[PDB]
Design a protein around this ligand. Structure first.
Ligand SMILES: Cc1cccc(-c2ccc(OCCCCCN3CCN(c4ccncc4)C3=O)cc2)c1
Ligand code: NA
Ligand code: NA
Ligand code: NA
Ligand code: NA
Lengths: 297, 242, 58, 245, 242, 58, 58
C-alpha cells in the first residue's frame, strides 16, 4: 500500500499519451467563404511569428475580398494507399548461360528494395512504414522473348538454408513457400504480409546492430537493422541440366494497407549505395534549377 | 465446368490494378502495432507545412549553397526599388523546388488551391522598414515598377515585434485545376508572378548592420488538392545502386 | 467472411472497404481508405495555441 | 505572456523572458509505456526526479562563419548523472525529452538559428568525393557524445537531404531580434516499446544558422549557444552490470 | 459463356496455396478413427516439455557422446569459481540444439517468450552445496567473476531433498519477437548468457564421491510462441535415400 | 452444402471452417483449425498433482 | 456496390443502369441511357413562341 503524499499524487506510470491534435474528416478541399473589407486595429492575421515553429494561420478570406466557392475537389488520391499502391520495379535478377555472375542456373537475391531510385525516394519520405505487399515476377529472355522454360522461386527466410546450386536439397521446399511457373504463363503474383519483428519497417536506423567497440572495420554495420532484413529470394531453372536459354527476372512490388510515421526531407542528391545515404561530395548540386539574378526570371 | 469466356485484358499485368493475390504464409499473424508518434494519413497534411523557399536560387558552388536559403534587404535610395521576384508556379522549375510542397507536387499531374508564402525578417531589432509584396495574376508581365505591381494582389509589410508576414497567393485560375506549367503551350497553366518592393526603406541607427536577410517559408492553403498521380521528373540514380 | 485478421492495418483509426477470396486478410485488395486528416500534428504543434486575429507574440 | 516562461522539473528550473512559445513534437506528450505495447516482462525502474531533470551539457560559439552542429539522443547523456548510470546498467531504455536551446545577444546583433529534431538521423559520407568509394562515418561521428559535431555540408545535412525541408520536423527558430531560446518537447519515437540507449539514437538535434550572425565592430563578439535538456518519463529494464558501449 | 478475365498468378503453383482440388475416389469413406492416446494439437504443446540440454557439448568421439548430457561439480577452493556458461539463444548453434525446443524452433523464423532451464543434481545424498546461476541480458559481456554475474537475473540454488531448481530466463527484449541469432548483424536478436558459479562449495563427508554431475532440462514458458514457418537449417541426407 | 463426410478429420474435438466445390469433403481446403492446447498431457502427466508453492516431494 | 463516384456522367439528368467489378465507377459498362429529348433547344429557341395554326409574323 501507499501512504506518503508525493507517491499518491505522482503521475509516474501514466500510459495515456495526451494528444494536442485530433484528425477530422476532409473528403474535399475546403470551401471559400464570402469576405469584405476590414479596417481594424488589434486584428492582424497577416502578421506572424515563424519563430514559434508553426505555419501561417492566415487564410484567403482575411487577406483579400473573396467570393463564396463550393469546393468539391477530392482528397482521395493523396492517401498513403493511393500514392504507394502502384507496382514499381525493385529488383532485377540475371540467369545467363555463359557468364560471370550466375552461370549455374540459379541465383540468390537479398530482399532489399533500395537499389531503385523511383521507389526508394518515395518510401524514404517516411521514417517508419508498415504494410502488406503484392509481388509480381516478370520473366523473359534478355530480348524480351518468351520461351518454354519452367522456373522455381523460393522464399528463404533468415535461418533457412540458401540453395548453393541448381540441384541443392533446399529446393525440396517442404516448409518454405515456393512458386513453380513457366515463362509462357502470365507473371507470377503473390501477397506478402508485414513480417518484421518490429511494429514497422524503418528506412533509417541511426545506430548499430550490436554492442561492443565500433572500430573502422565494423562501420559497414552502422545503420543496419535486422528488423528490415526479411530474407532471400532464390530462383532456379527446374532441371539437373543447364537451361538452354538465358533469363532475366524483374521483380515488382505493390504495397497495400499502408501506414507511415515521421515524414522526412526528400532525397535531393543521387543515390550511390543501397545500404546508406552516402552522396558524391564533389557533386553536391542545388535541389533545383538556378538563375542568373534574384531580380530576373 | 461452369461456362466462361475470356475477355480482352486477360493475362495482362496492370501495375495499378488493385487485385487479390494468393497469400504465401497461411495463418501468419503480424507483429502487433504499438503506438508511434507522427502518423501521417494524407500527403495533403504535409503540403500545409511550410518549408524554405529558395528565392535566391543563384549561387551554385558547394560553399555557397546555404546562401540560397535567404535573400537580402538593405538601406536604399527611396525610389521604391525592386528587391526580388519569382514565379508562383509551385510545380515549375525554380525556387519552389526547394520546398516539400514543390517536391510532393511533382508526383501529381494536376493541382488546385491557394498558396501562401510567409516572409521572416532576420535583421536586428533596431532595423525597421515597410515592403510591398505583390502577386500578379496570369497575363500581367513582370511589373516594371512598384506602381504597376501595386495594381495586383498585395500586402504591405511593416517590420516590428512580429518578425513575419504572410502573402496569400489566392487561387485565381480559369480552370478548376492547373497542370504543371512550363515554357510552351503549358504556360497556359501559369500561376503568376510575385515581386517584392521597398515601400519605405530599410532604416537602421548607428551601430547596426546595413544589411539583413529575409527567409521565405511556403506551403499550401486548406483548399489545396492534387490529382492524377504521376512519376516525378527526377530519378536520383546514374548507374546501378550497389 | 470468417477469415484471419493478419492485415498490416488491423486496428487502424481509418477503416477500409476491401475484397478477398482467401482465409488470410492481407491477401485482400487495398480498397478505399477513410479520408481523415490532422495537419496540425505537423503544421501547428504548439502548446498554447495562438489565434489568427491576434499577434502571435503576446 | 507567451514571451515569458519557466520550466521546472526535478530540482532544476529554467527561466526566459524572450520565448516564442513551446513546441510539442508531433502533437503529443511523453508517456510511460502501456501494458499492451510492452513486451519485456520484468518490472521496470522509474527513477523519476533523479533522472528527469535539466542537464546543461555543452556550449558552442556562434561565429559569422559557423556551419551548424548536431547532437544525438540519448547519446549526449549516456555518461552524465544518474540518468547515464541507469542507461549503462540497463539493456532497455525509453524516455522523452524537453530540449531548451539558449542564445542571447543584443538588439543590435542579428541572425537566425533553425533548431530542429530529426528522428533516426542517419549520417552519410562524401563517398570519397567522386562517389566511388563506399566509406562510412566512424563511431565518433555518428555518436559524437556531448560535444556534438559540426556539419560538413549543412545544405544536405551530411545525409543527402535538403535542410530547406527540415521544417517538416518539430522545430523553432532563434531569431535574435525576436527570441533568445527554443523549447521543444519530444515523445519517445521508435518502432519498438524500449531500446538500447547505447546502440540506438532515436533522434538528432540540429542547430544550424540559416541567417548569418552579424554585428558592428564594438559589440560583444562572443555569442554562445548553450544546450540544456531534460529526460521525461524515463523507464529502464533488463538489469545487469554497467556497460559503456 | 460468362465474361471472365485472367489475372496474374494464373497457372502458377504456390506450394502453400490452400486450394480445392478434385477428389480421385468419389464416395470413398475412410476407415473410422478409433481413440488413440497422446494426440497433439499444437507444436507449442511440445515446446513446454523439458528435454536434456547439452551444456557440456565438447566431447565428440562416439564413445563419449553420452558425456555431453551432463556436466560436473566438485569440491573447490571457495573462490566463487566458475562452473559453466552458455548462450541462452534457443535457436542458435550450441547446447540448445539437443533439445526438442531447439529443433522445433528451427522450423520458425521468429520466436517470443520466456524460457526455463531446470537443473537436477545427481550427486550422493550426503553431498551439499549452493550454486549461483545467472542470466545476463543482452549487452552484458561474459561475467569475469561471480560478483559481476550476480548483478543480473539469478537464482541461488541449495542442494537438498529437492534435487532440482529452475532458472527462468524471462523475456527481456527490445522487439516483440526475435529472429534466430547468429554471429553478425543478427546478434541483435541474442537472448543473453547463462553462467553457473559456486556460491559456497560442494561439500561431502568421508566416503562419498568428490565429483557429481548435474543434468540440465530446458523448455519454454507458457508465453512462448513462434511465427513465420521456415525450413530447418539441416537436411539429413547426403545422396539419394534408397 | 450437402456432401459426403469423407474428410480425415470428420468428428474431431477441433472444428474446422473450410471451402469446397465437390461432393467429397476431403477435397475441401485445410481451412482454420481450433486453437485448443493440452500441454499437461505431455508436460505434467502425474497422478497426484503437486502445487508450485509447495515442495514436489512431500 | 460501395464504390468511388468517378464516372464522367456522375450527376447527369439521365440516369444509367450499369455493371462493374472494380472500386472505380468509370470502369463500369456504358449500360443503358435514359431516353429524354429536347429538340426545341435547337429547333425552336424562340422567346415568344408562335402557334402552328396562326401566321408566324403577327
Ligand atoms: C513465395 C515467394 C517467392 C519469392 C519471393 C517471395 C517474397 C519476396 C519478398 C518478400 O518480402 C517483401 C519485403 C518488402 C519490404 C522489404 N523491406 C522492408 C524494409 N526494407 C529496407 C531496405 C533497406 N533499408 C531499410 C529497410 C526493405 O527492403 C516476401 C515474399 C515469396
Ligand atoms: Na466438362
Ligand atoms: Na495471385
Ligand atoms: Na459464346
Ligand atoms: Na484439382
Amino acid at each position: 500500500g501507499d501512504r506518503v503524499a508525493d507517491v499518491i499524487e505522482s503521475s509516474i506510470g501514466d500510459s495515456v499519451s495526451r494528444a494536442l491534435t485530433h484528425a477530422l474528416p476532409a473528403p474535399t478541399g475546403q470551401n471559400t467563404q464570402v469576405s469584405s473589407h476590414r479596417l481594424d486595429t488589434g486584428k492582424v492575421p497577416a502578421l506572424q511569428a515563424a519563430e514559434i515553429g508553426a505555419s501561417s494561420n492566415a487564410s484567403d478570406e482575411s487577406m483579400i475580398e473573396t467570393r463564396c466557392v463550393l469546393n468539391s475537389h477530392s482528397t482521395a488520391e493523396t492517401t498513403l494507399d493511393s500514392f504507394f499502391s502502384r507496382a514499381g520495379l525493385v529488383g532485377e535478377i540475371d540467369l545467363p548461360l555463359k557468364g560471370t555472375t550466375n552461370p549455374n542456373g540459379y541465383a540468390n537475391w537479398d530482399i532489399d528494395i533500395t537499389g531503385y531510385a523511383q521507389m526508394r525516394r518515395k518510401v524514404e519520405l517516411f521514417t517508419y512504414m508498415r504494410f502488406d505487399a503484392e509481388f509480381t515476377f516478370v520473366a523473359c529472355t534478355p530480348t524480351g522473348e518468351v520461351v518454354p522454360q519452367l522456373l522455381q522461386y523460393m522464399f528463404v527466410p533468415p535461418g533457412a538454408p540458401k540453395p548453393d546450386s541448381r540441384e541443392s536439397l533446399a529446393w525440396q521446399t517442404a516448409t518454405n513457400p515456393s512458386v513453380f511457373v513457366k515463362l509462357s504463363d502470365p507473371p507470377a503474383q503473390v501477397s506478402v504480409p508485414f513480417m518484421s519483428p518490429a511494429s514497422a519497417y524503418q528506412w533509417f536506423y541511426d545506430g548499430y546492430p550490436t554492442f561492443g567497440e565500433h572500430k573502422q572495420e565494423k562501420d559497414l554495420e552502422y545503420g543496419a537493422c535486422p528488423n528490415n532484413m526479411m530474407g532471400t529470394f532464390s530462383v532456379r531453372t527446374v532441371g539437373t541440366s543447364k537451361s538452354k536459354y538465358p533469363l532475366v527476372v524483374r521483380i515488382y512490388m505493390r504495397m497495400k494497407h499502408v501506414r507511415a510515421w515521421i515524414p522526412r526531407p526528400m532525397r535531393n542528391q543521387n543515390y550511390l549505395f543501397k545500404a546508406n545515404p552516402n552522396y558524391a561530395g564533389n557533386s553536391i548540386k542545388p535541389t533545383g534549377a538556378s538563375r542568373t539574378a534574384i531580380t530576373t526570371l | 465446368g461452369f461456362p466462361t469466356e475470356l475477355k480482352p485484358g486477360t493475362n495482362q499485368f496492370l501495375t495499378t490494378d488493385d487485385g487479390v493475390s494468393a497469400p504465401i504464409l497461411p495463418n501468419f499473424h503480424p507483429t502487433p502495432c504499438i503506438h508511434i508518434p507522427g502518423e501521417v494519413r494524407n500527403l495533403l497534411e504535409l503540403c500545409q507545412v511550410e518549408t524554405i523557399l529558395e528565392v535566391n536560387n543563384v549561387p551554385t558552388n558547394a560553399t555557397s549553397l546555404m546562401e540560397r536559403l535567404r535573400f537580402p534587404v538593405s538601406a536604399q535610395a527611396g525610389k521604391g526599388e525592386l528587391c526580388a521576384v519569382f514565379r508562383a508556379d509551385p510545380g515549375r522549375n525554380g525556387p519552389w523546388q526547394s520546398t516539400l510542397l514543390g517536391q510532393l507536387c511533382g508526383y501529381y499531374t494536376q493541382w488546385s488551391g491557394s498558396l501562401e508564402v510567409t516572409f521572416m525578417f532576420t535583421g536586428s531589432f533596431m532595423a525597421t522598414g515597410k515592403m510591398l509584396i505583390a502577386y500578379t495574376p496570369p497575363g500581367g508581365p513582370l511589373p516594371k515598377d512598384r506602381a504597376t505591381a501595386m495594381l495586383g494582389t498585395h500586402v504591405i509589410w511593416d517590420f516590428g515585434l512580429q518578425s513575419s508576414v504572410t502573402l496569400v497567393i489566392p487561387w485565381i485560375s480559369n480552370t478548376h485545376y492547373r497542370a504543371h506549367a512550363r515554357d510552351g503551350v503549358f504556360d497556359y497553366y501559369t500561376t503568376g508572378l510575385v515581386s517584392i518592393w521597398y515601400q519605405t526603406n530599410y532604416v537602421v541607427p548607428i551601430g547596426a548592420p546595413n544589411t539583413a536577410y529575409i527567409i521565405a517559408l511556403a506551403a499550401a492553403q486548406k483548399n489545396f488538392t492534387m490529382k492524377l498521380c504521376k512519376d516525378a521528373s527526377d530519378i536520383l540514380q546514374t548507374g546501378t545502386i550497389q | 467472411s470468417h477469415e484471419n485478421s493478419n492485415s498490416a492495418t488491423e486496428g487502424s483509426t481509418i477503416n477500409y472497404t476491401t475484397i478477398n477470396y482467401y482465409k488470410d486478410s492481407y491477401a485482400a485488395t487495398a480498397g478505399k481508405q477513410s479520408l481523415k486528416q490532422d495537419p496540425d500534428k505537423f503544421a501547428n504543434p504548439v502548446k498554447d495555441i495562438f489565434t489568427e486575429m491576434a499577434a502571435p507574440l503576446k | 505572456s507567451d514571451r515569458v516562461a519557466q520550466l521546472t522539473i526535478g530540482n532544476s528550473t529554467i527561466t526566459t523572458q524572450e520565448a516564442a512559445n513551446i513546441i510539442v513534437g508531433y502533437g503529443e506528450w511523453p508517456s510511460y509505456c502501456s501494458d499492451s505495447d510492452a513486451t519485456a516482462v520484468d518490472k521496470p525502474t522509474r527513477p523519476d526526479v533523479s533522472v528527469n531533470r535539466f542537464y546543461t551539457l555543452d556550449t558552442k560559439l556562434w561565429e559569422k562563419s559557423s556551419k551548424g552542429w548536431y547532437w544525438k539522443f540519448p547519446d549526449v547523456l549516456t555518461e552524465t548523472g544518474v540518468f547515464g548510470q541507469n542507461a549503462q546498467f540497463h539493456y532497455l531504455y525509453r524516455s522523452g525529452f524537453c530540449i531548451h536551446v539558449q542564445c542571447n545577444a543584443s538588439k543590435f546583433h542579428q541572425g537566425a538559428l533553425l533548431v530542429a529534431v530529426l528522428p533516426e538521423y542517419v549520417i552519410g559520407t562524401v563517398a570519397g568525393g567522386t562517389g566511388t568509394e563506399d566509406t562510412h562515418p566512424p563511431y565518433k561521428q555518428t555518436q559524437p557524445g556531448a560535444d556534438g559535431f559540426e556539419l560538413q555540408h549543412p545544405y544536405v545535412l551530411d545525409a543527402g537531404i535538403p535542410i530547406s525541408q527540415l521544417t517538416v520536423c518539430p522545430h523553432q527558430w532563434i531569431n535574435l531580434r525576436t527570441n533568445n531560446c527554443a523549447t521543444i518537447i519530444v515523445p519517445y519515437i521508435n518502432a519498438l516499446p524500449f531500446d538500447s540507449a547505447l546502440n540506438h539514437c532515436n533522434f538528432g538535434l540540429l542547430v544550424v544558422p540559416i541567417s548569418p550572425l552579424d554585428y558592428d565592430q564594438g559589440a560583444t563578439p562572443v555569442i554562445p549557444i548553450t544546450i540544456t535538456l531534460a529526460p521525461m518519463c524515463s523507464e529502464f529494464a533488463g538489469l545487469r552490470q554497467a556497460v559503456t558501449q
